[PDB]
Ligand binder design. Sequence first.
Ligand SMILES: Nc1ncnc2c1ncn2[C@@H]1O[C@H](CSCC[C@H](N)C(=O)O)[C@@H](O)[C@H]1O
Length: 264
Amino acid sequence: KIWSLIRDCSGKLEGVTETSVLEVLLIVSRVLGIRKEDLFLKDLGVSPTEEKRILELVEKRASGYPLHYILGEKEFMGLSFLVEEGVFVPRPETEELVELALELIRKYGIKTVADIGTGSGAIGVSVAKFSDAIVFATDVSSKAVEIARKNAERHGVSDRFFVRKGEFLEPFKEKFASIEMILSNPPYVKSSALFEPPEALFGGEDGLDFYREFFGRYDTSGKIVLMEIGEDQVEELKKIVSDTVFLKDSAGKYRFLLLNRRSS
Ligand SMILES: Nc1ncnc2c1ncn2[C@@H]1O[C@H](CSCC[C@H](N)C(=O)O)[C@@H](O)[C@H]1O
């Protein structure tokens, strides 16, 4: 059977994953070359090369290597984002930033938006696909820039999502002024601490370098700045940026900084 294979592949993963069966289900679909809902048909056996690939990938995973890198894909705001080693894998917590972002575009009629450190493009691509905004996106990784460009093509929004390599908004200076809302899910981990990129997790000794450099260099008058943040960085953020508000996600951990300097 392939349902035994499935059940043995998973015990192998009551390590790294809490959701071993589902991760097995997904690794199986991907080798068999199939949509996940096809696993249920009859005449669904898995023939060698196949069974071969599955324990292969299955153990590459018991190790802690990322599922989504194996899968080549991660769903975020209901969309399929291509991901590969070198790109940060979108996290569920971040969908919250986007829905808050969307509520903001509707509330104000915002038309131009930026997404600092785009990664796979999860934030800006979703904002583009689900609103009328135009989005300027940046990443220091040329590998993120690439994948993000394709995810934009992949979702029909290359005409409203532009990514440029470089840091912060340095590559879009010509556009700084016209930008109404600045979005980011930047590195915020105490570097005073895994297969995702360092550039993407680490925020210096205290995990704030990113905000210190940003609110330090950019004049934000007239703009709405919405950024994801570490659970424990509120009190210290209140001193780099004094007029910000701070929201909790669906869980109750503070997760977002909102600095609304739009007017009237
Ligand atoms: N100063 C900086 N300017 C622009 N991008 C930066 C940067 N510092 C880190 N990055 C980028 O920030 C991203 C952080 S990970 C988050 C990626 C994506 N926004 C998501 O939410 O899934 C990485 O892709 C990294 O390349």
